[PDB]
């Protein structure tokens, strides 16, 4: 009993851990327990591939489950690494299963950095191994048949799946063995052989000849189509062609022989004989042309006995006319087989090593989302500040709201006194004197770290160039020069960072030198400060004016409008939406994650209320600034240009500008300090990459 099976494809060993850990780390918190398992999974994985492919093969469910498990686990990884860009290069090398190449050289090999290549080959080997285990079943007992039937159908389904994916999964052309046509024929061969197995069960179970005939006929139809496909393309091994021809005939004969029994049971004696003659013709040709692949003697004898006896009853008793074959009805067909669909997991008790790892399409949509959210928040925030800066600068420009608090040109207007006290309580100038003094020191600290860092590289690179010089042979290595190119690139950037930071130091310092005198004045105790603000004769005409009460509450609103920006900015920054689980839903419930529409929609939901209140502020300020500029210049009519009051006005306008500048300056200095301290953190790390690498060398 000869059944076709397929040989496994050979692959070269390939470091599977390498491109995976590399990325794994580029992706997680170093030392972080993420890496603790994900890197520990890409180990088991490489050790699995070794087992599922490198091993000299053992024809049992053990080695097949390992191979099945390997197919599963590979499929479970595609969405969780950036194979798509393929910038994560790992190369898979497979040989042809049949040594089939268009050009006349035995083995044609093919290596590809396509996980789709890997997938098709593992699956082909899965179908082939299944085909070999099927072919070994004992088709005399009930479980031999069940296992063979299940495996031929599995192989059929796997080969078919390969036929329908292989090209989309590969850029270029496949080796022959796995090309859609070769795998289409193998899938049909496997399906034919599973029909055969069912024909054999039907037989062993002594079912009605009508059934057995239809089963055998169906099998013949399968074997015949596979035969045809092979007739004018020779991409399968040498013994496959004759064997298909043989089994095609032997299955037609079995169909004839069983139908002939049905004919005799119906007294169609002429048909019985015609069908047996056909069966004998077929089996006779098989016996003499494919004796190398097939044994048909028992079948030939059983037919010959039935034909002899049928002819005896007919020649002597029945005298029924024997029909031409062209004139018989077709025998029917009944299929009990299905090529089995591939639906990972195909292995039993599958467990996905990287189940917890986040789909790469989700992490990309999360990052994209944050660049979108930062933009939303920063924009809104910067818009507001600029607007507050503008309004404060305008009010100063108008001596507002000092002017309308200035009842007697004799004392410190209340707004000035409040601002003064506000400044004194935050330390006064000695607060700004400190930050300005310590700024050049935080800068130095960082130059120093960057400098010692790079000196390390310079010094180790030096001895390395010397050693290679005096010991060419015993000191062969990649030069330090080449190894250090990356780190010296970070270095150079860092340098350009310090360039910008210093540039900003200079701007802040020039602002501090140009406003430090007024501020020192602003910080004086009330009487001393008052005695430094020139007196003026206050026009009492102003108390109660229409221009004044309007301006006054026109200014009240402007104040509320700006203390409002404080909560606003604080709310923009204090909220956050974790979008992962919303991205997961879009990916499970759907084929793809469309983040743009998804995040735009969530941003509008989370931030929309504020990005609208913010938006209100600005145009509400515009309304206020417009109304104030006009309503003021009317207050400018009642205004009276006497040099006593002009001096007073100068000084008041300047103290208010001084408050603004104090507030702004302190903020640019705290900012700059936070920056230099973060920079120390980042630079200290960079100094570790440097020493670690000078001492691994």
């Amino acid at each position: 009993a000869t059944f076709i099976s397929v040989q496994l494809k050979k692959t070269s060993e390939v470091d599977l851990a390498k491109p995976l850990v590399k990325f794994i780390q580029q992706t997680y918190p170093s030392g972080g327990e993420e890496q603790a398992q994900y890197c520990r999974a890409a180990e088991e994985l490489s050790k699995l591939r070794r087992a599922a492919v490198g091993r000299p093969l053992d024809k049992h469910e053990g080695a097949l489950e390992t191979l099945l498990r390997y197919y599963d686990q590979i499929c479970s990884i595609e969405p969780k690494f950036p194979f798509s860009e393929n910038q994560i290069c790992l190369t898979f090398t497979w040989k042809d299963a049949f040594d089939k190449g268009s050009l006349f050289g035995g083995s044609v090999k093919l290596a590809l950095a396509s996980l789709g290549y890997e997938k098709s080959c593992v699956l082909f080997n899965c179908a082939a191994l299944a085909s070999q285990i099927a072919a070994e079943q004992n088709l005399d007992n009930d479980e031999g048949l069940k296992i063979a039937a299940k495996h031929y159908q599995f192989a059929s389904g796997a080969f078919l799946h390969i036929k329908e994916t292989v090209l989309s999964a590969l850029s270029r052309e496949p080796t022959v063995d796995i090309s859609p046509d070769t795998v289409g024929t193998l899938s049909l061969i496997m399906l034919a052989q599973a029909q055969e197995v069912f024909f054999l069960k039907a037989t062993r179970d002594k079912m009605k000849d009508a059934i057995i005939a239809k089963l055998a006929n169906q099998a013949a139809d399968y074997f015949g189509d596979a035969f045809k496909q092979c007739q004018y393309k020779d991409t399968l091994p040498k013994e496959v062609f004759p064997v298909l021809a043989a089994k095609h005939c032997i299955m037609q004969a079995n169909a004839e022989y069983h139908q002939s029994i049905l004919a005799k049971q119906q007294y169609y004696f002429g048909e019985e004989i015609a069908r047996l003659q056909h069966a004998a013709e077929l089996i006779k040709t098989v016996a003499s042309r494919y004796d190398e692949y097939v044994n048909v003697k028992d079948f030939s004898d059983k037919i010959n006995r039935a034909l002899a006896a049928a002819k005896k009853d007919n020649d002597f008793i029945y005298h029924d006319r024997v029909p031409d074959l062209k004139d018989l009805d077709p025998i029917g067909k009944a299929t009990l087989v299905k090529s089995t669909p591939v639906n990972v997991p195909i292995s039993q008790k599958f467990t996905d090593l990287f189940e917890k790892m986040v789909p790469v399409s989700v992490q990309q949509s999360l990052a994209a989302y944050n660049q979108r959210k930062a933009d939303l928040v920063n924009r809104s925030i910067a818009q507001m500040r600029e607007a507050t800066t503008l309004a404060n600068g305008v009010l100063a420009s108008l001596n507002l709201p000092a002017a309308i608090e200035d009842v007697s040109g004799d004392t410190v207007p209340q707004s000035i006194l409040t601002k003064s006290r506000s400044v004194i309580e935050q330390g006064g100038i000695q607060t700004v004197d400190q930050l300005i003094k310590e700024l050049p020191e935080l800068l130095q600290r960082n130059r120093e770290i960057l400098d010692e860092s790079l000196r390390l590289l310079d010094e180790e690179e030096a001895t390395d160039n010397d050693l290679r010089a005096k010991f060419k042979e015993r000191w062969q290595r990649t030069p330090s020069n080449e190894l250090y190119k990356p780190l010296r690139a970070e270095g150079t950037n860092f340098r350009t960072v310090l360039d910008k930071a210093v540039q900003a130091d200079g701007q802040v310092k020039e602002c501090y030198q140009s406003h430090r005198d007024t501020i020192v004045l602003l910080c004086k105790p009330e009487p001393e400060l008052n005695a430094a603000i020139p007196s003026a004769n206050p026009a009492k005409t102003m108390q109660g004016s229409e221009v004044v009460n309007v301006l006054k509450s026109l200014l009240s609103n402007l104040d509320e409008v700006k203390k409002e920006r404080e909560g606003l900015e604080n709310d923009l920054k204090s909220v956050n939406f974790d979008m992962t689980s919303k991205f997961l839903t879009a990916l499970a419930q759907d084929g793809v994650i469309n983040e743009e529409a998804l995040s735009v929609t969530e941003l509008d939901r989370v931030y929309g209320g504020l990005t609208t209140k913010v938006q209100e502020s600005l145009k509400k300020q515009e309304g206020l600034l417009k109304n104030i500029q006009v309503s003021h210049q009317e207050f400018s009519k009642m205004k009276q240009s006497n040099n006593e009051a002009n001096l007073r006005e100068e000084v008041l306008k300047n103290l208010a500008t001084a408050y603004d500048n104090f507030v702004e300056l302190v903020a640019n200095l705290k900012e700059g300090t936070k920056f230099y301290n973060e920079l120390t953190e980042i630079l200290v790390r960079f100094q570790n990459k440097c020493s670690d690498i000078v001492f691994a060398r």
Binding site: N493, V497, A501, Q503, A504, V508, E671, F675, I682
Partner: peptide, 9 residues
């Protein structure tokens, strides 16, 4: 004021 430098990080 130090925003331009944070950008380069």
């Amino acid at each position: 004021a130090y925003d331009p430098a944070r950008k380069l990080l």
